[PDB]
Write an enzyme that holds these catalytic residues in place. Structure first.
Site, short mmCIF file in Angstrom:
data_model
loop_
_atom_site.label_atom_id
_atom_site.label_comp_id
_atom_site.label_asym_id
_atom_site.label_seq_id
_atom_site.Cartn_x
_atom_site.Cartn_y
_atom_site.Cartn_z
N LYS A 1 -4.96 -0.25 4.93
CA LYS A 1 -4.06 0.83 4.55
C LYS A 1 -4.69 2.18 4.87
CE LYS A 1 -0.92 3.39 2.60
NZ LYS A 1 0.56 3.33 2.80
N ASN B 1 -4.45 8.46 11.63
CA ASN B 1 -3.00 8.54 11.42
C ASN B 1 -2.60 10.01 11.51
OD1 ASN B 1 -0.34 8.50 10.62
ND2 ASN B 1 -0.69 7.40 8.68
N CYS C 1 1.95 10.56 9.33
CA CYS C 1 2.63 10.20 8.06
C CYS C 1 3.74 10.95 7.95
CB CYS C 1 1.71 10.21 6.84
SG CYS C 1 2.49 9.47 5.36
C1 LIG Z 1 5.65 0.16 3.14
C2 LIG Z 1 5.08 0.75 4.40
C3 LIG Z 1 3.85 1.40 4.33
C4 LIG Z 1 3.30 1.96 5.48
N1 LIG Z 1 2.08 2.61 5.41
C5 LIG Z 1 1.53 3.15 6.57
C6 LIG Z 1 0.29 3.79 6.52
O1 LIG Z 1 -0.33 3.88 5.46
N2 LIG Z 1 -0.24 4.33 7.68
C7 LIG Z 1 0.42 4.24 8.88
O2 LIG Z 1 -0.08 4.71 9.90
N3 LIG Z 1 1.64 3.59 8.94
C8 LIG Z 1 2.20 3.06 7.79
N4 LIG Z 1 3.43 2.42 7.85
C9 LIG Z 1 4.19 2.32 9.14
C10 LIG Z 1 3.94 1.03 9.89
O3 LIG Z 1 2.56 0.99 10.19
C11 LIG Z 1 4.77 1.00 11.18
O4 LIG Z 1 4.37 2.09 11.98
C12 LIG Z 1 6.29 1.08 10.94
O5 LIG Z 1 6.67 0.33 9.80
C13 LIG Z 1 7.08 0.58 12.14
O6 LIG Z 1 6.77 -0.78 12.34
P1 LIG Z 1 7.84 -1.92 11.95
O7 LIG Z 1 9.13 -1.67 12.69
O8 LIG Z 1 7.30 -3.29 12.33
O9 LIG Z 1 8.04 -1.75 10.46
C14 LIG Z 1 3.98 1.86 6.69
C15 LIG Z 1 5.20 1.21 6.76
C16 LIG Z 1 5.76 0.65 5.62
C17 LIG Z 1 7.09 -0.04 5.72
C1 LIG Z 2 1.72 7.83 5.39
C2 LIG Z 2 0.62 7.60 4.35
C3 LIG Z 2 0.86 7.35 3.08
C4 LIG Z 2 -0.32 7.12 2.12
C5 LIG Z 2 -1.56 7.18 2.55
C6 LIG Z 2 -1.83 7.47 4.02
C7 LIG Z 2 -0.82 7.66 4.86
C8 LIG Z 2 2.63 6.60 5.51
C9 LIG Z 2 3.96 6.53 4.74
O1 LIG Z 2 4.00 6.79 3.60
N1 LIG Z 2 5.19 6.07 5.38
C10 LIG Z 2 5.24 5.71 6.74
O2 LIG Z 2 6.24 5.37 7.27
N2 LIG Z 2 4.10 5.79 7.52
C11 LIG Z 2 2.86 6.24 6.97
O3 LIG Z 2 1.98 6.24 7.69
#
Ligand SMILES: Cc1cc2nc3c(=O)[nH]c(=O)nc-3n(C[C@H](O)[C@H](O)[C@H](O)COP(=O)(O)O)c2cc1C
Ligand SMILES: *[C@@H](c1ccccc1)C1C(=O)NC(=O)NC1=O
Ligand SMILES: Cc1cc2nc3c(=O)[nH]c(=O)nc-3n(C[C@H](O)[C@H](O)[C@H](O)COP(=O)(O)O)c2cc1C
Ligand SMILES: *[C@@H](c1ccccc1)C1C(=O)NC(=O)NC1=O
Lengths: 304, 313
Positions: free
Chosen positions: A45, A120, A123
């Site tokens: 994460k 990242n 966000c």
């Molecule tokens: C619940 C959730 C939490 C996520 N947390 C992060 C994150 O902490 N950092 C990040 O770079 N992407 C985060 N993402 C984005 C995913 O890494 C991904 O870029 C996005 O969901 C698109 O991929 P998918 O179509 O397979 O969901 C998160 C996505 C979801 C749904």
């Molecule tokens: C962005 C995020 C959240 C918590 C800690 C570090 C980075 C994250 C989000 O909340 N939602 C997204 O779709 N992508 C993210 O990367």
């Protein structure tokens, strides 16, 4: 006579599949489940020094939540079995200063264990701060600060772009930073809005219901971004992320240029067993076409 | 006692539905079909000062969850749509919008100078397209806030009447705030249409391993179910930030429930693109019936009872 192996960053990955950052990777038990799975890799994460919702065609989230950099650095240093698979760590500091501080500390652990950083820059739920990579001056300063503070190679997680002037500007900046060895396309499509017909209410609480979209909604946007950066950054690896549910989806990501393929929404729904299904489906498509290795068609999407 | 009427812009609309610009609105036969349909209104294809044949085919493709297109602004030219507005359209059937999309601020302003007397006499309403995602070499105008301001200044100087603007999707609040700040400085902008297609997606066929449309290496604008949460977010963001303007919703409408959500987010009119391309003009009979069903189950008698009333958590 076929293989899903991917040889990148000096590692042999068993196959191109991994979780997307933020999905099944916050708790020590989730990391363990990811390591036990058949995925080629896994990522933590995004760490710093109702918020989710299942939709018919994907997901929306406003996570905004992590056990801190020290927990994931500690996991990287002495708790991850690297003999099972390589490990990526995602960091999302609230400034260039914070990011640089975290990188100074990961440097020894990266040198002694081989963990790989993904920065990242996208966000979409950061209160008061738009996606860093939608501001090309901020993007350049983050990358310069990280390149000066961090001796090892790293990758960047990008937000989606929607026109060639932004692709061209983003790539021209990334191509000036040789330590950026891979680009992950894409983070969620930012600030969508979902409303429930029955309650007439938004489905997630923070930010007046606006949140990041994932899943089937984002697949053509993800492929476009993968291919756009594949063409403009031939000296870097592209990791595809967005809308993968089947090995056929993964096949298209690779055709567009992806080296690794990350799985977010579909993994959140199906759990780590999905990687068993994804590898078999991808090998199935390759068999039908007579491909023996991903290097034979990665980036070879044709004009018609 | 239930009603889908919309009273805006000095007109009465029978219901909120119309086509999205570019769908079923390029030829006289299509415009006549839209006029004969049960839609509350209709809009012409975005036009240029001269006729254009558009991008080489295939330039449209049906996707599992919507559409991708690189139409390239194929259109009969401004004189054709001006003539339709001036002489052919039956205004006793329903109001008419005309979409213009010249390649420069000056091209747009020259078209507005000729449209002005027809707008004054017949009542056709202008929608300015600031969001083509398929113009070679020129990005979405509204993705460049200096150009956006320049276009609006040029149109407002050349055109005496109120007009609307068709906007591209935005994806962060900084851009919403910057776009709204500009729009709120132009009193003639009376409505904002959210959204044009999500620009420059890419579709690849597994079997042929090739892109499915020809222009621009296969990149093109996405419509349909892909864009629905983005469209609602843009409708609601501008509804909140531009209280003195109307918002028209466009994106992902296939059912009366989808339209209900657009209105709840703040939409005054609801435009239908990909779904209408696939189903034809009978779709409007189904959408009005479906929206009335949603309203009846909730006890709503008029759209103003819930327009813009999405609830927070
Ligand atoms: C619940 C959730 C939490 C996520 N947390 C992060 C994150 O902490 N950092 C990040 O770079 N992407 C985060 N993402 C984005 C995913 O890494 C991904 O870029 C996005 O969901 C698109 O991929 P998918 O179509 O397979 O969901 C998160 C996505 C979801 C749904
Ligand atoms: C962005 C995020 C959240 C918590 C800690 C570090 C980075 C994250 C989000 O909340 N939602 C997204 O779709 N992508 C993210 O990367
Ligand atoms: C084939 C096609 C042609 C289009 N032509 C125009 C156009 O000329 N002017 C314009 O403003 N939008 C045009 N659009 C965009 C639509 O007006 C609409 O904004 C978009 O399709 C999203 O709506 P939807 O989800 O209902 O398809 C076109 C869309 C398609 C699919
Ligand atoms: C853009 C356009 C530009 C000039 C004349 C006519 C139409 C158009 C397009 O090609 N594709 C879209 O998705 N939306 C548009 O508005």
């Amino acid at each position: 006579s076929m293989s899903l192996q991917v040889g990148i960053l000096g590692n042999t990955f068993a196959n191109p599949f991994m979780n997307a950052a933020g999905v099944m990777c916050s708790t020590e038990e989730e990391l363990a489940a990811m390591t036990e799975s058949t995925s080629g890799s896994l990522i933590t994460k995004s760490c710093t020094p109702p918020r989710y919702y299942t939709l018919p065609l994907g997901s929306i989230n406003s996570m905004g939540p992590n056990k801190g950099f020290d927990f994931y650095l500690a996991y990287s240093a002495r708790h991850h079995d690297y003999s099972r698979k390589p490990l990526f760590i995602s960091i999302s500091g609230f400034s260039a200063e914070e990011n640089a501080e975290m990188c100074k500390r990961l440097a020894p652990v990266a040198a002694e264990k081989g963990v790989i950083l993904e920065l990242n820059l996208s966000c979409p739920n950061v209160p008061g701060k738009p996606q860093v990579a939608y501001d090309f001056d901020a993007m350049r300063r983050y990358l310069a600060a990280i390149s000066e503070a961090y001796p090892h190679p790293f990758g960047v997680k990008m937000p989606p772009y929607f026109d060639f002037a932004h692709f061209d500007a983003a790539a021209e900046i990334l191509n000036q930073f040789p330590k950026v060895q891979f680009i992950t396309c894409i983070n969620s499509i930012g600030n969508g809005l979902v409303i429930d017909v029955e309650t007439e209410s938004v489905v997630i609480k923070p930010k007046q219901g606006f949140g990041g979209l994932g899943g089937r909604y984002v697949f053509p946007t993800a492929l476009a971004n993968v291919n756009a950066f594949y063409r403009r950054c031939p000296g870097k690896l592209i990791f595809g992320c967005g809308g993968v549910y089947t090995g056929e989806d993964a096949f298209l990501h690779v055709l567009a240029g992806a080296s690794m393929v990350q799985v977010g929404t579909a993994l959140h729904e199906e759990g780590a067993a999905i990687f068993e299904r994804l590898t078999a489906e991808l090998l199935d498509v390759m068999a039908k076409k007579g491909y023996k290795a991903l290097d034979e068609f990665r980036g070879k999407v044709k004009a018609m």
